[PDB]
C-alpha cells in the first residue's frame, strides 16, 4: 500500500502541475480533463487510505491525506489567484472529503492508543486550514473563508478531546504542547483577521483563544497536581508571551476591545504563575521560583514598552502594578535564597532585577514619563538596599569575592543609569544615582579592607 | 648530459628574454649579438642531444629538442610581431634543423621499441607547428605558413607510420589515441584556415583529415578483430563528435563544400557504429550496444540543432533520416534486452530516447518546423507503445516498482512536452500528448491496483 | 591582595568612564565628586601595592601601578582634549606619585635579584610616558611635556642601572634588549619632536640617544668578551637600522644637525661591526662574518637611497665610501670561505653582493648619478671576476652543478642590469654588460663541456 500511495501522490502532483499550465494559459478544455483525472486519483487515494487503515497502518493513512490536502490547497491557490470559482468549488469539496477522512484517522489513532499521532494530524490540518484561510482572506473570498472557519472549529473541538485523552493517559506534557501550538496558530489566524480588519473572524478566534486558555490553565493545574511545577511554569510562561504578542497586534491596530480581553487574560496568567512560584518555593526550589519571576518581569517590561510607545497609560498602569507585585515576590525569593544559605542566587536575582529596572527606567526617561521613572527609581533604591545586605551576608560567609562582584556589577549599572540621566539632563535622577554610587564605593573599600585582612 | 642540457636550455631562455628587450627597444646591435649567441647555444644543444642518444637516453634527447623548438617558436613570435624578417628567417631555419633532429629521435625511439615516446614527440611537435602556423596565419605570412604546412605534412606521415608500428605491436589503443589527437589538431588547424578564409590550407587539412579517418576506421576494424568492441565504439564516437564540431565550423562559416565532405564522413562513421552495435549484440553486450546508439542519437540531435538554427534543410533531412535509423536499432536493442530478461535496461533505453525526442521536438517547435515535429511526434508515439509493453513485462516479472517508475517518468516527460505545446499554442500536439497522458494514467492506476494486490 | 587590587582597578576604570561622561557633558559637579572618588581609590591601591610588596609579590605590585598609571594617562587625555587644566593638574600629580612608587618597586625587584621584572617595569613606564608626552606635544602643553620629559630622564637613569645590574649578573642579552628597546622608544619620541618642531625636546632626546649608544657599544664589547660574537653582531645591526631610521627622519625634515650626529653614530657602529666580522673570522665563523657584511651593505644601500632621493651628495659620498669598505671586507670573507673549502658560501656572498650592487646601480641610473653608477659598475666588474674564479674553484672541486648555477644566476642579473641600461638608454653601461654577458656565456659553454665529459 506504500508504493500504491506513492504512485498516486506523485501522479496527483504532476496533474496539478499540468493543471497550472492549463490555468495560466487559460485552456479550459485541458483543465477540465485534468480536473477529472485529479478526481479519479483522489478516489483511488482514499481507497488506499482505507487499505492502510485495514492493514493497521494509521500512520501511512494520515500521511496520504495530509499530503493530498496540501496538494489540494495548492491547487485551490491556483484557482483563487486565477479566479476560477468552478475549480475552486470542486477543490473545496475535495478538501472537505479529505478532512472527514482525516478525522476518522484521528479517531483510529486514538482507538489505537496513539494520541500523539492523533494530535499531529489535527495540528497539521489546522495549520493547512489557516494557510487556506489566508488565501481566502487576502482574496476576499468570504464563502471559502466561512467554510474553512467552520472546518477550523471542528478541528479545534477534536484537538481539545485529544488533549483530554492525553490528560487521561497521564501525558500532561503532550496535552500542554497541543494547546500551546493551537494557541499560537490561533494568534496567527487572529493576525490575519486583524490586518484584514475582519472583526467577525477575529471574534470567532478570540473566543477560541479563550477556550484554549481555560484548557491550558487546567493542564497547569494537572501538572502541579503531578508534582511537575517546572512544566506548569513553562506553560504559563509561553502562554503569557503569546498573549503579549497578541496584545502587540491589538495595540498596533488600535483594537481596544481585543487588548482589553488579552490584558485580562494576562492578569489571570500572572496570578497562576505567582501560585506556581509559591509551589516552587514550597518544594524547596527557589531557583525555579526566581526564574519564573525574572522571566515574567522581563515580559511585563516588554509589554510596558508597547504601552509606553503607543502611549497607552491605562495598560502601562496595569503593567506597572503587575511589575510591583513581581518585585515584591522576587525580594521574598531573595530572602528565601539567603535563608537557604544561597547568597549567590540571592545576588543574581537582585542583579538581574536591577538591570531590568534600569532598562525600564530608560524607557521612562526617553519617553519622558516622570511618574513611571519615579516608581522605578524607588524600586531601584529598594533593590540596592537588598543587594548591600547580600554583600554583607557574603562577607559574613567569608566570600569577599562574591561581595566584590556584586558591588562592582551594581556600580557599573549605576553608572549606566547615570549616563541616561546625564544625556537626558535629569539632575534629580543623577543626584540620586551619584549618592548610590558613593554608598557602593564605601562598601567596596570595606571589601578591599576585608580582602587585605584575608591576605588576598 | 642532463645538467649539460639544463644549462643550455636555461641560457637559451635567458638569451631570448634579452633578445626580447633588444627587439622591443629596437637595438639591432644587441639583437645581433644575442642571435649569434643563440645560434652557438643551439649547436651545443644539438651535440648534447647527440650525446644523450649515444647514451641510450632518447627520452632526454627528445625533451631537449622539444623545449628548444618551443623556445624558437616563442622567439619567432617576437620576430613576427615586430616584423623582423631577418630574425624570423634565422629562427625558421633553426626550427627546421630541430625538426630533422626530432624525427631522427622518433626513429631512434621506434628502433628502441618505444612507439609511445615516438608518438608523443610527433604529437607535441605537430601541436607546436600548428601554434606557429597560427602566428603565420594571423600575421598573414604566407611564406612561413607554407614552410610550416610542409613540416606539418611530414610529421603526419611519420605519425601514421607510428600508428602502423603500434598496430604491428598489437597496441591498437595507442594507434587510436594517436589518430584521435592528430584529427583534433587538424580540426583546430582547419578552424584557423576557416576563420582566416585560407582555402588552400583548409584544402590541405581536409585532405589530411580524410586520410586520418581512413586510418581510424582500420584501427576500429583491428579493435573489432581483437574482440575489443568497446574501443571500436569509443573511436567512432569520438571521431563522430569531432566531425560534428568540424561541421559546426563549416555551417557557421557557410562552407557547403567542407560541410558536404564532413556529412559524408559522418554517414560512413554511423554505418561503422551500427556494425559495432551489431557486434556488441552478437557478443551478448546489449548494454554497450544501447550506449553506442544513445550517444550517437544525442550527437545527431546536436547536429540537427545546428541544421535547424542555420536553416539547412538538406543537412537536417540527412540527420533526421539518420535519427530514424538509430531509433529502429535502439528498439531492437530494447527487444534484445527484454529477451535477455533485462527489463530495467529496456526501460532506461526508451526513457532516454523519449527524452531526447522531446528535446528534438522542442527544437522543431521553437523553429516552427512542423515536418520535423510530425516525424518526432510519431517517433514519440512508437516509444510510448514500447514503454507500455516494458511496463507490462515488469508487472509480469513481479516488479511493480519498476513498472511504476517507468510510467511516472513518462508522464512527467509528457507533461513537459505538453508545456511546449501549450506555450507554443500547438493544439494538435497538445491533443496527442493529452491522449498519451490519459493512457499512462490508466496504466498507473492498474499498477496501483497491482501494488495493493501485492500488499504494498 | 590580588582580589583587593582587582576590585579597585575595576572601580577606578568605571570612575574614569563616569568622569568621561561628566567631562563631555560639562558637569563639573559630578566630575568633582568622581575625581574625589578617584583619589580615594588611588590611595587604597597604593596601600594594596604596599601589601603586595610586604607579601613578597613585587610582580603584582608592579602590575597594579602599571595599570593605574595607564588609566591616569587615559584620564589625562580626557582632561587635555577637554582643556580641563584643574583635572589635568590633579592627574599629573597622581601620575608623579605612581611613578615614585613604581621606581621603588623596581628597586625591590632588583633587591630580589629580578632584574628582568625591574627592566619590564621601566620599559612599560617609559612607553607610557612617551604616550603622555605625545598628548602634551600635540596639544601644545609645554608644562606637562616638561614634567614628562623630566620623568623620562629619571626612568632612563634607572634603566641604565638595570642594564648595569644585568651585565653584573652576566646577562648581556637582557642588557642589550633593554637598551635596544629604550633606543627605539627614544627615536619614536624624537619623531614627535621632529614633526612638531620642538628642538628643545629633540636636543634632550638626541643626548639620551647618544648615551644609550655608548652603553650598547660596551654591551657589544661585553658580548665579544663573553665569546658571543653573534649577539654582538645583532646589537650593532639593530642599532644601525634604528640609526638609519632616525637619519630618515632628519633627512625628510631637513635637520642637518641631527643627520650629522646620526651619520657620525653610523660610522662608529660600522667600525664596531667590522671588528665583529674580524672576530667572527678569527672564530672560524665565516658564515656569520658574511651575514654581518651582507646586512650592513643592504642597510647602507637603503641609506644611500635616502641620500639619492633627497639629493644629499655629502651623505651619499660618506655612504658610498662605507659601501666600498664593506665590499673589500666581503671579498676577503669570500677568500676565507674558499680557503675553508666552502665554495658554496663564497658564491652566495658574491651573488648577493652583485644583486645589491645592481639595485644600487638602478638608483644611480634612475637618479642620473653617473659618478655613483661609475663606482658601482666598477664594483660589479670586480665581483664578476671573483665569481668566475669561484666557478673555476667549483669546477676544480668536481662540482659542475654549482659552477653552472653561479653563471646562470650571474647572467640573469647581467640581463636585468642590461634592461636598466636599455630602458635608460645608457649605451656605455649596456656595452660593459654585453661584454660581461659574452664572458659568462663562454664560461657556461665550458661548464657544459665539463658536464658532458662527466657523463651528465
Numbering used by the authors:
A (entry chain B), B (entry chain A), C (entry chain C): 1 to 456
Reproduce, without paraphrasing, sentences from the article in which this PDB structure was first reported.
Having demonstrated the accuracy and behavior of a designed thick(er) cTRP (tcTRP) harboring nine repeats and a relatively acute radius of curvature between sequential repeats, we next decided to generate and examine a similar tcTRP harboring 24 repeats, corresponding to a considerably larger internal and external diameter and a shallower curvature between consecutive repeats. We therefore attempted to promote the closed toroidal form of this construct by incorporating a pair of cysteine residues at neighboring positions across each subunit interface so that a disulfide staple might lock the protein into the desired closed topology. Based on the tcTRP248 design, an alanine at position 5 and an isoleucine at position 7 (respectively located within the N- and C-terminal repeats of each subunit) were mutated to cysteine residues, with the intention of installing potential disulfide bonds within each interface of the intended tcTRP248 trimeric particle (‘tcTRP248SS’). Reasoning that the designed disulfide bond might only form after cell lysis and exposure to a non-reducing environment (and during that time, would compete with misfolding and fiber formation), we isolated the slowest eluting half of the final peak (corresponding to the expected elution of a correctly formed trimeric particle), concentrated the protein, and subjected it to a second size exclusion step and analysis (‘tcTRP248SS Run #2’). In that second run, the protein now ran as a single uniform peak at a volume and predicted mass corresponding to the desired trimeric assemblage. The structure of the isolated tcTRP248SS construct from the final SEC run was then further examined by CryoEM single particle analysis.
Circular tandem repeat proteins (‘cTRPs’) are de novo designed protein scaffolds (in this and prior studies, based on antiparallel two-helix bundles) that contain repeated protein sequences and structural motifs and form closed circular structures. While these cTRP constructs have many favorable properties, we have previously noted that their ability to self-assemble from smaller subunits is compromised by relatively limited contacts and small surface areas that are involved in packing between repeats and subunits. Based on those results, we hypothesized that a new generation of computationally designed cTRP proteins with increased repeat size (corresponding to longer secondary structural elements that increase both particle thickness and the number of buried contacts between repeats and protein subunits) would improve both the energetics and the stoichiometric control of self-association. In this study, we describe the de novo design of thick cTRPs (‘tcTRPs’) with repeats composed of longer helical bundles that form a new underlying repeat topology and demonstrate their solution and assembly behaviors, their structural features via X-ray crystallography and CryoEM, and their ability to be functionalized with additional folded protein domains.
